[PDB]
Design a protein around this ligand. Sequence first.
Ligand SMILES: *[C@@](O)(C(=O)NCc1ccccc1)[C@H](C[C@H]1CCNC1=O)NC(=O)[C@H](CC1CC1)n1cccc(NC(=O)OC(C)(C)C)c1=O
Ligand SMILES: *[C@@](O)(C(=O)NCc1ccccc1)[C@H](C[C@H]1CCNC1=O)NC(=O)[C@H](CC1CC1)n1cccc(NC(=O)OC(C)(C)C)c1=O
Lengths: 302, 302
Amino acid sequence: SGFRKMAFPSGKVEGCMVQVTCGTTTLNGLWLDDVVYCPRHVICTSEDMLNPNYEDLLIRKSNHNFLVQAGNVQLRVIGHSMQNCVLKLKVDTANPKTPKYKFVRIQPGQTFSVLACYNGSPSGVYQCAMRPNFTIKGSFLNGSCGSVGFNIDYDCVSFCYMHHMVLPTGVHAGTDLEGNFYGPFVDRQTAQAAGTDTTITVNVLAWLYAAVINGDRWFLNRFTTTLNDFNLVAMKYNYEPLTQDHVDILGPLSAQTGIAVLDMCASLKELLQNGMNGRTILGSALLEDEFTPFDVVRQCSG
Amino acid sequence: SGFRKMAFPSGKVEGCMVQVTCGTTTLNGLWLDDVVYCPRHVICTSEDMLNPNYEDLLIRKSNHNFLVQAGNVQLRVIGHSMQNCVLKLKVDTANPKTPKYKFVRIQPGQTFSVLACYNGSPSGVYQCAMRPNFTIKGSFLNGSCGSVGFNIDYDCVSFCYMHHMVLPTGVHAGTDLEGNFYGPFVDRQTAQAAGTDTTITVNVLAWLYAAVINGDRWFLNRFTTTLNDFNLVAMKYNYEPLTQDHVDILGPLSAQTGIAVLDMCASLKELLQNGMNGRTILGSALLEDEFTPFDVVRQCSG
Ligand SMILES: *[C@@](O)(C(=O)NCc1ccccc1)[C@H](C[C@H]1CCNC1=O)NC(=O)[C@H](CC1CC1)n1cccc(NC(=O)OC(C)(C)C)c1=O
Ligand SMILES: *[C@@](O)(C(=O)NCc1ccccc1)[C@H](C[C@H]1CCNC1=O)NC(=O)[C@H](CC1CC1)n1cccc(NC(=O)OC(C)(C)C)c1=O
């Protein structure tokens, strides 16, 4: 009963957050086994930020002046292997709270929970999605850098996101944990295109399959359409093309619900050209597209 | 940058969740020091649920047949003091993870995070509010009972909510941790009025003060009104009266922002009669009222 934007419990990650300081900039790190992960630009001294030289700093910079803190427990630094845009510090102590964990790259449309931190301490958790343009609509301030996004797969923490920067439109770009940016972004202060964002067609459908479940079923209509026609409706309405995979994934829902994906497709396109008239689906006057088919199911079976 | 519905980190509570079984019903408990808290109707055997006798069960029921589990660690039961609608079991072991913690009653309009659990294990966290009618719009299924709502005050966990039941409209009622229901609700299967819910005027204002901050400022208008006139606008639009306290709390925002509360009041009432034309404030086509003035500030200063 009810249907909410809902993040994974943050406990298993909370135990991995630490502070990382270097001169003028302190930001967050992730303490996994005997290594700690942070955005490499922890070594930038502003100035550098206009167009930096992360080769001609990394090796030229020394362990000692990297102040790692695990609350107070000032972790004893060792290594400094740089992977892309992450800086990985091996440390004398290994994490006793280290959860069963994993580094993963997510595709656009997938969601994760974000645990937003400052000075190595968490302030809160929210769920967002990798946008088609490879941005995320998150909530970050000064010091949020190194904050991480994650899924939990039973007792297993899949880490997908580390936060690096804000983009023109108050949206956010960051890397995976092997330090490669989502989207064509660099850690530098240049004019970077956000990109024109599509709506995640499948996620909006899965949302309506969550509605009908939770009794709200008014939007429903007396028509149907084709996977082709639909798509060309999508296009003027900046909806990602819908694909056979997308259909085959909306099955397990469309199944239980009765309603076949292609009716919901018409039920949807009706809403797209018509307006919403100021009525609301699951307490929203807008089409929500940050819920994966999967997201729905876990919030309808623990 | 950005603005999200955001829950407190769940770590400190996760360590307090346990399973509580009695015959046909297993649900969640809260393990604080050497006592564990759960909804008293863990002892109901259906049937009872039509109109129960929690006097003529509590004492008549025996410790041993209460199966408390802390993961596997089958906690050794002792006590059975019943406070209102909670059943409090003292146990041989005290919680080493017991956080600095506190039992508190929240007023309508205030928010808390919910950590929704099944079989004593958490599935996710979301933020919701005590609705004026004393309901909450949450996301709960079978086994969610005993799930708790909370705020965190630095290292201090204020517990406000324990979940008991669903109401007509797919909304939720539950107690404080001293076992007294929010609203006029009872743990029994009778026809219970949800109640007609107002919109939390102050929270909707604090939301707009969060908008302007995060650059979205279009809604803004060329007028003003009075605290009186406004209120009588509120009334047809089911907005709670606005009060001097409500004003004095929107200060610290209205301050930093420049804009004085009474302009935003006109800026608001314009939106109320006019429609939203299908444009959006902070990625919402509806007036959001589950953000306290406080909620905004912490998400603009860690
Ligand atoms: C990180 O938090 C960070 O790298 N800085 C940590 C810090 C900052 C102040 C004091 C102590 C520690 C931020 C993300 C923050 C910034 C404001 N809101 C956030 O979400 N990342 C950056 O500052 C980032 C660094 C880049 C090398 C990778 N960055 C630098 C310069 C300019 C921008 N963006 C910006 O203002 O441009 C737009 C596109 C107009 C928004 C930037 O993100
Ligand atoms: C709790 O989870 C619970 O008490 N039951 C735990 C349980 C259930 C099945 C198997 C194992 C353990 C639920 C809350 C759940 C129920 C479905 N969605 C939820 O949020 N609470 C109740 O079941 C509650 C117990 C009352 C004594 C306090 N309860 C009982 C009967 C009827 C209702 N509500 C209902 O269906 O009525 C409405 C108003 C039409 C919705 C109820 O909530």
